[PDB]
Write a protein that binds this ligand. Sequence first.
Ligand SMILES: [Mg+2]
Ligand SMILES: [Zn+2]
Lengths: 122, 69
Amino acid sequence: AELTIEDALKVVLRTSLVHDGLARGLRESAKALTRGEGQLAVLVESVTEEAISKLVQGLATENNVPLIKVADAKQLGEWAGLGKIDRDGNARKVVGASVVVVKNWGADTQEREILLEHFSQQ
Amino acid sequence: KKVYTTPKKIRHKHKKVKLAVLNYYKVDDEGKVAKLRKECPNCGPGIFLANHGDRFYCGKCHSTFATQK
Ligand SMILES: [Mg+2]
Ligand SMILES: [Zn+2]
């Protein structure tokens, strides 16, 4: 694929990190949501508890839903910003990020957000 | 220098005691997301007051709420 292969999301995450806006964890996500501080929602896939996932979904529904699920949590952790620096080519301490909610957005325009918008408004 | 005597007590701090995290919420019949514990009147939903035996203090306000409910 010449266009976006799930890496628009990654880009967005990176931008957020740069400008300080990633609400990581469940509680943080909830906080972001209930006040209207955070906008985007990344949902858990490898949920052995599932209750947490359900809660997240509910939260997303409650105010505004530009929801996305991606692929697990470990991957997210690896990508966005978890596991200590380690050289240029990954090989970090492999750690999961659980849940992500985006504040600030980050950069301007791009193929960053169009997909998200499409997902949301139907 | 003087011989060190020491009159007992080798104290420590609160090491948090990490309980459950999301226990102040309920999700029921698919889609619904119902709230447990009273939300803070100082700063809205997200921060909810601690409910004890007529003790109603906060966390972002750290302590500043005491009134009966
Ligand atoms: Mg002494
Ligand atoms: Zn508070």
